Amino acid sequence: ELHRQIWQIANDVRGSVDGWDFKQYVLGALFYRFISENFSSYIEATDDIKDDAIKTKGYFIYPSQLFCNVAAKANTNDRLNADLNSIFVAIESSAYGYPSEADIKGLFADFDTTSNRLGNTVKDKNARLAAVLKGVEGLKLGIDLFGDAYEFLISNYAFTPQHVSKLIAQLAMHGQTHVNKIYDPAAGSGSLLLQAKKQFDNHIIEEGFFGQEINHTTYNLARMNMFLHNINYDKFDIKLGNTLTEPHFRDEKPFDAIVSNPPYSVKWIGSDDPTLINDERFAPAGVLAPKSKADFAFVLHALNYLSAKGRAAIVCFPGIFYRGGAEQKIRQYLVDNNYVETVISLAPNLFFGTTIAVNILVLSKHKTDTNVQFIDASELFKKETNNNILTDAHIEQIMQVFASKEDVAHLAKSVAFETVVANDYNLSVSSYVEAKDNREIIDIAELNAELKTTVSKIDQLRKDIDAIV
Amino acid sequence: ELHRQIWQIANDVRGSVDGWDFKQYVLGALFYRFISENFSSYIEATDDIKDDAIKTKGYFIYPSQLFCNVAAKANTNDRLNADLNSIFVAIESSAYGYPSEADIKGLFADFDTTSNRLGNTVKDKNARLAAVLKGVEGLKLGIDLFGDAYEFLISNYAAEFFTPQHVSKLIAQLAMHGQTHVNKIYDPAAGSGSLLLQAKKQFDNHIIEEGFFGQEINHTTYNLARMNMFLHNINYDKFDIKLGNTLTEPHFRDEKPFDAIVSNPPYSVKWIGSDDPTLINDERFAPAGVLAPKSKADFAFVLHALNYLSAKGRAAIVCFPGIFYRGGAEQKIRQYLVDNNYVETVISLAPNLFFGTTIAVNILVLSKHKTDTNVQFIDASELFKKETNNNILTDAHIEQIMQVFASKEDVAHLAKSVAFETVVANDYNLSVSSYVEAKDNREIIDIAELNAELKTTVSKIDQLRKDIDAIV
Amino acid sequence: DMQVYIANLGKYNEGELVGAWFTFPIDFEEVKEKIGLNDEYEEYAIHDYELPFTVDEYTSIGELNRLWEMVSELPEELQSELSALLTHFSSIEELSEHQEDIIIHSDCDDMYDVARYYIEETGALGEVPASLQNYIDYQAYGRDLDLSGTFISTNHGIFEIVY
Amino acid sequence: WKTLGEIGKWYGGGTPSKNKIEFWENGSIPWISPKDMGRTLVDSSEDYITEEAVLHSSTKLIPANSIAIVVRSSILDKVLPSALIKVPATLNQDMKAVIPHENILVKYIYHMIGSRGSDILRAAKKTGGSVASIDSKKLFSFKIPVPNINEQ
């Protein structure tokens, strides 16, 4: 059962330290078991539950052409299980290095960098790895419900819950089967790009789900994240590092749909320590962003990499509010054309380790020609903890609002461009329609008034009788 | 104003990472800074900030006895911090061995567990040493608590025990009285013993006799607390701190039956018995009769505190207020403490007056210096329990608390001594007496009556004319 | 305080190096008698300055006195932290627009103190029960205000650029 | 349909230095705080800041017929506090003050604020989801019925 195996992970492997430290070891053993099962399944296309050391290079080049990981002859987890509980540790340290040799072609590697380790003594390390490999080995995993365990394990208590990601995907998708998708700037996890394949299992992949990300452990877990979902080798890769400093590919290409989840006010010192005034992505802004934010660098980066059907679904804290004349001319350059089209605000919290209401910007190089906001404060189904969830077809209600420019009361609507330039370029004061307004009738209140005054008066003269001194 | 500047430096050096590794930077740099002040000032008589092989370790063995090191003749804060792209890598874990081992004599091992030799990169590492220890090299005066930044680097999460100095001043001035004696001083279960710093560096020219044999669990906390006093000239030639757990290892058990001690017993001090070893039949829990349970073993510490005790010298401890007498599991314990006046006095405090408790505690002062009468000489407030920027020298109260603790000052809205048999007549008040007479008002029937009558008679015609105006 | 080494473009290689320091207000004829002339008028070679801000290499002296009058216009605690405040802004008339919009905190020294001030003494929520007295996450409150509000950490306090 | 604030030159306030001990303890000008607010007809506040504090407070001197208004810390959620301030008193930038001018009745202005409170909360409503709250802008920019001086 789904939650039963989730419960198995929630008890058995959770030992015996904080989960962020043994997380790497658990997911590495899980990933190794996955490659074991996948490679064993592939070589059957005749009873390799136990292998044979008959490695043919003219035949072993075909996984390197095809899956680009020849595991070994007989160094898989099914074959580790016999030699499980034996000397020694670093056979896995070898059996990381050997399948990661694989230079032919497009390595997508340097990758299993987890186990180092600590550990305090060598027999302790050996017993701990034996326990971890047995506990991963002692699971009931059938064959396709494998990434769901990764979805749960990454959803530890500590990350963008699945309905919000689904909302971003449906905002990214209508009327569209058009290579390519996707690019992601500052990808973080691939958990939001998971739903991209659930969309793209339907027709086909188009190009690689291109990301770039900063933190190297997050980079590795994201690469194995989109590896685990039966996603082909060829296209689907992430670049390491900042996108504000060195985005790549610059040349490749103007994109057609892009998503994001930028961090919270992470700083950057580049204005203008290099000539970022004279770049290709910050120059139509005219000014650069201050050091207390980064988000508009992402959005100008975004609209740089964008086609005629290019749309940009990005998220924000409300630091895009008005925030002054430079941020005005950001907003102005956005409303210079129909660059930004709709915005969507949500309600707090809906997010892990976070408070505030969030904002959803929709961008396109496509006519409207006005801003039609599509905003609620409730609902925003706030019953399951905490604003959770925007349920199935609750989001379809919001997408139906998004569909053709509707103007629903107690819900947002179109504004005039002349109104929003007459406004000082704000969000989302229009509309915010008037909840919980009540009034009553005179006669009930005044009859209650006069009767309670009569009760009060007879009680007052009775108190005067009770004034006994 | 100067500590505003030092405070801002303490804020800014926290960029960009926390003081777990900056522990090593601050302690090693400030340590050799103290060396280049003191030890090098011994060998000034005008030559070198840029110190060289002028130490003469054959004759400089005297600070290798007294300062307990010849630290670095050729590896100074100037002779290690210059450049980029040198050879070699490794200058911060292992092989400053001649100050770290330093067996001759009085060595006090795990003395230099911060930065000796290793080491990760070529001069990203050693130019990190160069640039960062040069930016710390010039952090001038702008010296008693010149590691106020270190009193804030250990207080980085503290903005669990990290020595609230007003409470520390309260214990040190409540170590008084009956104190010009020998020894000076003992401390069991010390932790960050800067309470010992304002207990003895304040009393330095007053009386200074013996070493401060604290005992804590966390080894890094142990070592930082050891060198903490030594940062600002509290000598660690022999005056030292022992490591371990205090009940499994109450060393020194032989030296001695102590006279004057203080402590702050923390939480996370519980332990399981009851007792499986011969602490079932030891010197202190067999007088207890019933023994310390798995959780409330705080009450063992006072049993430890009477184990190290004499009649003249008095002992100040504290406990979080889970002691009324805690039922029959601790009643006889309490009864043992009122078998005689083993406990002398108790004092209450105010929540918070700590770091986020927000509970009071109970100060228990123990001497076998009896009258005999039960003491409830407590005062919750005030004790202006806001912060440390009003009533900073005295609380307007430490002399008043001192006088109440001196001799039996029985002031109302404050509790006084009761009979020794009253605590066994009552069911061991700790502390319900006295809590005298807050917010008890009384007024005149006529004044409260006629004014209400007048304002009603205003209100009646207001109601009538309101009904007039309620017409459309 | 606020003095410039400005002479001269004649002998462009800082030949005819004259005119040591000029505190404000600064006159053409005062500096001209300080330096003479370079047989023509090519002077105020901006090369060095004790100023609390950033100035340009060819700024005219009337603009320099203009900048100084804007400095002297501002309060002295803001004159001490012009370097920090101008990071958010770009000019001084720009700063003179929102010079009313600065919240000064000598009382608050970190973000924690900002949270404790705006909660406790401001009374932004009213009830502080003793069961709830400790239980106000000043850290997360400061994180959320740091996300929303423009804050600047300085020496003399914390300056909040509220609009 | 007089647009807001146009009836009389309403004020902003001004924040002193609390470290000025001469300008914080002595004197008798009532220093008005939003915790002094929430009441009604507060001629004098609890705080008694200095009369010479106007050297280093940048406040506004008020007559005996002023009204007060807050822009922080409780509105964006509720109805705005208001009090009739009646002495020469001073106030910071945490809140503002209105004096009307001659086209009015200051009690009618006061209760025009309090009356339209359910909608003048909405008028310049969000202007930031912080402790920072309702601006001056659409607190200046709404048409209210203001009759002639015979009808207030």
Which residues in chain B are closer than 8 Å to A467, comparing Cβ atoms? 449
Of all residues in chain D, the one with the smallest CA distance to C146 is: D130
- Residues pairing with A362 in the sheet: A313, A342
Q: How far apart are CA B286 and CA B307, in angstroms?
A: 12
Residue B193 assigned ligand-binding role: yes
Which residues in chain B are closer than 8 Å to C130, comparing Cβ atoms? 358
For A275, the domain range is 162-422
Longest dimension (CA), chain B: 109
Q: How far apart are CA C6 and CA C56, in angstroms?
A: 12
Those residues whose C-beta lies under 8 Å from the C-beta of residue B132, and which sit 6 or more positions away, are B25
Q: How far apart are CA A28 and CA B362, in angstroms?
A: 52
Which residues in chain A are closer than 8 Å to C90, comparing Cβ atoms? 326
A296 closest CA partner among A273, A274, A317 = A317
CB contact under 8 A, D130 and C149: yes
Q: Are A96 and A47 in contact (CB under 8 A)?
A: no
Residue A290 assigned ligand-binding role: no
Of A356, A429, A434, the CB nearest to D126: A429
Task: Write down which residue in A154, A173, A191 finishes a domain.
Answer: A154
Does the residue B198 lie in any domain?
yes
Q: Are B319 and B298 in contact (CB under 8 A)?
A: yes
- Residues pairing with B291 in the sheet: none
Q: How far apart are CA A201 and CA A194, in angstroms?
A: 11
Give D1-152's CATH code, choosing from 3.40.50.300, 1.10.150.120, 3.90.220.20, 1.10.357.10: 3.90.220.20
Does the residue B441 lie in any domain?
no
Looking only at the bridges linking them, the beta strands covering B315-319 and B261-262 are parallel
Look-up: residue for tokens 């040069």? B134
> A271: number of CA atoms within 13 Å, CB side?
19
Question: What are the φ and ψ backbone dihedral angles of A126, each rounded to 5 degrees?
Answer: -65, -45
Distance from the first to the final alpha carbon of chain D: 14
Neighbouring chains of D at 3+ CB pairs under 8 Å are: A, C
What is the SS3 assignment for B61-109? HHHHHHCCCCCCCCCCCCCCCCCCCCCCCCCCCCCCHHHHCCCCCCCCC
> B197: number of CA atoms within 13 Å, CB side?
24
**Same domain, residue pair B417 and B290:** yes
CB contact under 8 A, B358 and C112: no
- Residues pairing with A212 in the sheet: A239
A356 contact C CB<8A: yes
Q: How far apart are CA C33 and CA C143, in angstroms?
A: 57
**Same domain, residue pair B35 and B169:** no
Look-up: residue for tokens 């990499």? A305
Question: What are the φ and ψ backbone dihedral angles of D110, each rounded to 5 degrees?
Answer: -55, -50
Distances from the Cα of A207 to the Cα of A108, A170, C7, D119, angstroms: 16, 19, 63, 53
Residue of A410, A425, A429 for testing the chain D interface, max D β-carbons within 10 Å:
A429
A432 contact D CB<8A: yes
Total residues found in chain D within this entry: 152
**Same domain, residue pair C111 and C131:** yes
**Same domain, residue pair A362 and A279:** yes
Q: How far apart are CA B99 and CA B111, in angstroms?
A: 9
**Same domain, residue pair A269 and A123:** no
Residue type, D102: E
- Could you give the dihedral angle defined by the CA atoms of residues D63, D69, D73 and D74, in that order, rounded to the nearest 10 degrees? 130
Q: How far apart are CA B50 and CA B59, in angstroms?
A: 20
Q: CATH number of the domain that A130 lies in? A: 1.20.1260.30
The DSSP output letter for C119 is: I
Of A318, A357, A429, the CB nearest to D125: A429
Question: What are the φ and ψ backbone dihedral angles of B375, each rounded to 5 degrees?
Answer: -115, 130
Q: CATH number of the domain that C82 lies in? A: 1.10.8.560
Q: Are A468 and B445 in contact (CB under 8 A)?
A: no
Does the residue A467 lie in any domain?
no
B242 closest CA partner among B230, B226, B229, B256 = B226
Q: For the beta carbon of residue B71, count every other beta carbon within 10 angstroms.
A: 24
The two structure tokens encoding residue B254: 């032989």
Q: Are D16 and D24 in contact (CB under 8 A)?
A: yes
In angstroms, how far is CA B15 from the centroid of its own chain?
27
Q: How far apart are CA C101 and CA A136, in angstroms?
A: 59
Does the residue B452 lie in any domain?
no
Residue B384 assigned ligand-binding role: no
Q: How far apart are CA A125 and CA A130, in angstroms?
A: 8
A185 closest CA partner among A137, A103, A250, A280 = A250
What is the SS3 assignment for A143-169? CCCCHHHHHHHHCCCCCCCHHHHHHHH
What is the SS3 assignment for chain B? CHHHHHHHHHHHHCCCCCCCCHHHHHHHHHHHHHHHHHHHHHCCCCCCCCCCCCCCCCCCHHHHHHCCCCCCCCCCCCCCCCCCCCCCCCCCCCCCHHHHCCCCCCCCCCCCCCCCCCCCCCCCHHHHHHHHHHHHHCCCCCCCCCCCCHHHHCCCCCCCCCCCHHHHHHHHHHHCCCCCCCCCCECCCCCCCCHHHHHHCCCCCCCCCCCCCCEECCHHHHHHHHHHHHCCCCCCCCCCCEECCCCCCCCCCCCCCCCCEECCCCCCCCCCCCCCCHHHHCCCCCCCCCCCCCCCCCHHHHHHHHHCCCCCCCEEEEECCCCCCCCHHHHHHHHHHCCCCCCCEEEECCCCCCCCCCCCCEEEEECCCCCCCECCCCCCCCCCCCCCCCCCCCCCCHHHHHHHHHCCCCCCCCCCCECCCHHHHCCCCCCCCCCCCCCCCCCCHHHHHHHHHHHHHHHHHHHHHHHHHHCC
**CA torsion through residues B128, B130, B131, B134, sign:** positive
Domain count, chain C: 3
Residue A210: strand, helix, or coil: strand
For residues A310-324, b (16+ Cβ closer than 10 Å) or e, as one string? bbbbbbbbbbbbbbb
Residue B194 assigned ligand-binding role: yes
Q: Are B19 and B26 in contact (CB under 8 A)?
A: yes
Which residues in chain A are closer than 8 Å to B449, comparing Cβ atoms? 467
Longest dimension (CA), chain D: 49
Q: How far apart are CA B297 and CA B284, in angstroms?
A: 13
For C28, the domain range is 1-59
Question: What are the φ and ψ backbone dihedral angles of B466, each rounded to 5 degrees?
Answer: -65, -45
Of all residues in chain C, the one with the smallest CA distance to A292 is: C150
Neighbouring chains of C at 3+ CB pairs under 8 Å are: A, B, D
In angstroms, how far is CA B287 from the centroid of its own chain?
30
**Same domain, residue pair A95 and A206:** no
Q: How far apart are CA D7 and CA B116, in angstroms?
A: 76
* Gap from C44 CA to chain A (nearest CA, Å): 27
Question: What are the φ and ψ backbone dihedral angles of B414, each rounded to 5 degrees?
Answer: -175, 150
Does the residue A447 lie in any domain?
no
Question: What are the φ and ψ backbone dihedral angles of B425, each rounded to 5 degrees?
Answer: -70, -55
The two structure tokens encoding residue C50: 């004790």
- Give the DSSP H or E segment for A79: helix A77-80
**Same domain, residue pair C54 and C4:** yes
Residues of chain C whose beta carbon is less than 8 angstroms from a beta carbon of chain D are 100, 103-104, 106-107, 118, 121-124, 145, 148-149, 162-163
Q: CATH number of the domain that B386 lies in? A: 3.40.50.150
Q: Are B337 and B374 in contact (CB under 8 A)?
A: no
DSSP letters, A289-356, are: --TT--HHHHHHHHHHS--SS-EEEEEE-TT-S--SHHHHHHHHHHHHTTSEEEEEE--S--STT--S
Which residues in chain D are closer than 8 Å to A424, comparing Cβ atoms? 137
Domain count, chain B: 2
- Give the DSSP H or E segment for A450: helix A442-466
D38 contact C CB<8A: no
A241 contact C CB<8A: no
Residue A245 assigned ligand-binding role: no
Q: Do chains D and B touch (3 or more CB pairs under 8 A)?
A: no
The DSSP output letter for A193 is: H
Which residues in chain D are closer than 8 Å to A357, comparing Cβ atoms? 129
Residue type, A45: A
Of all residues in chain D, the one with the smallest CA distance to A425 is: D127
CB contact under 8 A, C100 and D35: no
Of all residues in chain A, the one with the smallest CA distance to D118 is: A437
**Same domain, residue pair B301 and B176:** yes
Q: For the beta carbon of residue B325, count every other beta carbon within 10 angstroms.
A: 19
Q: CATH number of the domain that C145 lies in? A: 1.10.10.1190
**Same domain, residue pair A64 and A196:** no
Those residues whose C-beta lies under 8 Å from the C-beta of residue B46, and which sit 6 or more positions away, are none
Residue type, B92: E
Which residues in chain A are closer than 8 Å to D140, comparing Cβ atoms? none
Identify the experimental approach. Answer: cryo-EM
CB contact under 8 A, B449 and A460: no
Spatial strand order of the sheet with C102-105 comes to C102-105, C158-161, C150-153
Neighbouring chains of B at 3+ CB pairs under 8 Å are: A, C
Q: CATH number of the domain that C13 lies in? A: 3.10.20.480
**Same domain, residue pair B22 and B92:** yes
Question: What are the φ and ψ backbone dihedral angles of B186, each rounded to 5 degrees?
Answer: -110, 150
In angstroms, how far is CA B297 from the centroid of its own chain?
20
CB contact under 8 A, C153 and B11: yes
Q: How far apart are CA B153 and CA B176, in angstroms?
A: 31
Q: How far apart are CA B336 and CA A366, in angstroms?
A: 87
In this complex, how many residue pairs, one in chain A and one in chain D, have their CB atoms less than 8 Å apart? 12
**Same domain, residue pair A116 and A185:** no
Distance from the first to the final alpha carbon of chain C: 31
Which residues in chain D are closer than 8 Å to C163, comparing Cβ atoms? 127-128, 132
The two structure tokens encoding residue B140: 């001038």
The DSSP output letter for A409 is: T
The two structure tokens encoding residue B285: 């829990």
Look-up: residue for tokens 């006095």? B345
DSSP letters, chain D, are: -EETTTTS--B------TT-SHHHHSS-EEEE-TTT-SSS--SS-SEEE-SGGGGSS------TTEEEEE-BSSTTSSPPP--EE-SS-EE-TTEEEE---SSS-HHHHHHHHHHTHHHHHHHT--S-SSSB---SSTTS--EE----TTT-
* Gap from D110 CA to chain C (nearest CA, Å): 24
- Residues pairing with A311 in the sheet: A257, A364
Q: How far apart are CA B416 and CA B409, in angstroms?
A: 7
- Give the DSSP H or E segment for A240: strand A238-240
Does the residue B239 lie in any domain?
yes
In angstroms, how far is CA B281 from the centroid of its own chain?
32
Q: How far apart are CA B202 and CA B165, in angstroms?
A: 13
**Same domain, residue pair C145 and C157:** yes
Residue B351 assigned ligand-binding role: no
Q: For the range A86-95, what are the long-range contacts, defined as Cβ-Cβ under 8 Å and sequence gap of 24 or more?
A: A87/A126, A88/A126, A89/A117, A89/A122, A89/A125, A89/A126, A89/A129, A92/A32, A92/A129, A95/A71
> A98: number of CA atoms within 13 Å, CB side?
13
Residue of B1, B11, B152 for testing the chain C interface, max C β-carbons within 10 Å:
B11
D49 closest CA partner among D63, D66, D36, D64 = D36
Q: How far apart are CA C117 and CA C111, in angstroms?
A: 10
Does the residue A440 lie in any domain?
no
Of all residues in chain A, the one with the smallest CA distance to B466 is: A446
Q: At what angle do helices B398-406 and B165-175 cross, to 10 degrees?
A: 30
D35 contact C CB<8A: yes
Q: Are A356 and A317 in contact (CB under 8 A)?
A: yes
Q: For the beta carbon of residue A95, count every other beta carbon within 10 angstroms.
A: 18
Distances from the Cα of D119 to the Cα of A219, A437, C49, C70, angstroms: 51, 11, 55, 41
**Same domain, residue pair A126 and A206:** no
Of C90, C140, C147, the CB nearest to A265: C147
Question: What are the φ and ψ backbone dihedral angles of C160, each rounded to 5 degrees?
Answer: -100, 115
Q: How far apart are CA D112 and CA D147, in angstroms?
A: 11
Q: How far apart are CA A417 and CA B411, in angstroms?
A: 76
Residue B98: Cβ-neighbour burial (10 angstroms; 0-12, 13-18, 19+): middle
Residue C87: strand, helix, or coil: helix
**Same domain, residue pair A256 and A346:** yes
- Could you give the dihedral angle defined by the CA atoms of residues B54, B60, B64 and B65, in that order, rounded to the nearest 10 degrees? -160
For residues C66-101, b (16+ Cβ closer than 10 Å) or e, as one string? ebbebbeebeebbbebbeebbebbeebeebeeebee
For residues D22-42, b (16+ Cβ closer than 10 Å) or e, as one string? ebbeebebbbbbbbbbeeeeb
Residue A412: strand, helix, or coil: coil
B341 closest CA partner among B321, B360, B319, B315 = B315
Residue A150: Cβ-neighbour burial (10 angstroms; 0-12, 13-18, 19+): buried
Which residues in chain C are closer than 8 Å to D131, comparing Cβ atoms? 118, 122, 124, 145
Residue A174: strand, helix, or coil: coil
Q: How far apart are CA C83 and CA C128, in angstroms?
A: 39
Q: Are B263 and B235 in contact (CB under 8 A)?
A: no
Does the residue A442 lie in any domain?
no
The DSSP output letter for A183 is: B
The DSSP output letter for A384 is: B
The two structure tokens encoding residue B233: 């000239």
Q: How far apart are CA B210 and CA B263, in angstroms?
A: 16
Which residues in chain C are closer than 8 Å to A290, comparing Cβ atoms? 87-88
Question: What are the φ and ψ backbone dihedral angles of A259, each rounded to 5 degrees?
Answer: -125, 175
**Same domain, residue pair C5 and C20:** yes
Of all residues in chain D, the one with the smallest CA distance to A438 is: D118
Distances from the Cα of B19 to the Cα of A19, A140, B155, angstroms: 24, 45, 10
Q: How far apart are CA A220 and CA A218, in angstroms?
A: 5
Residue A162 assigned ligand-binding role: yes
Residue A159 assigned ligand-binding role: yes
* Gap from C144 CA to chain D (nearest CA, Å): 9
Q: For the beta carbon of residue B260, count every other beta carbon within 10 angstroms.
A: 21
**Same domain, residue pair A150 and A168:** no
Which residues in chain D are closer than 8 Å to C118, comparing Cβ atoms? 73, 131
B356 contact C CB<8A: yes
The two structure tokens encoding residue B324: 């009324």
The two structure tokens encoding residue B213: 């044999």
Residue A8 assigned ligand-binding role: no
Q: How far apart are CA A181 and CA C59, in angstroms?
A: 52
Neighbouring chains of A at 3+ CB pairs under 8 Å are: B, C, D
